[PDB]
């Protein structure tokens, strides 16, 4: 009952990290490899690089 609780928490945690890894790859695409015009997505201000 202790491992099923730990593993259920790691599966939920890893989904929060997944959402953050998907967001990090989405910034590294649009925000580093480009110049995204999406307001406040890429620092406060107008985004240069």
């Amino acid at each position: 009952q202790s491992l099923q609780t730990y593993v259920t928490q790691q599966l939920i945690r890893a989904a929060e990290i997944r959402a953050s890894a998907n967001l990090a790859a989405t910034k590294m695409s649009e925000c580093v490899l480009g110049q995204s015009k999406r307001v406040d997505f890429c620092g406060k201000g107008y985004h240069l690089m």
Partner: protein, 49 residues
């Protein structure tokens, strides 16, 4: 006799609760200042009242 489950359940619900204010902060508190309209409604014929 069942160990840390008690605390693990209290900690987990506290983790959710303390996040609901991170959600409410990041959705609404994006604006640095309390901006206000002038009292007179000279908005081109558009009626935001």
């Amino acid at each position: 006799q069942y160990g840390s489950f008690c605390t693990q359940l209290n900690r987990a619900l506290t983790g959710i609760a303390v996040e609901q204010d991170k959600n409410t902060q990041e959705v609404f508190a994006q604006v640095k200042q309390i901006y206000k309209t002038p009292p007179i409604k000279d908005f081109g014929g558009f009626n935001f009242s």
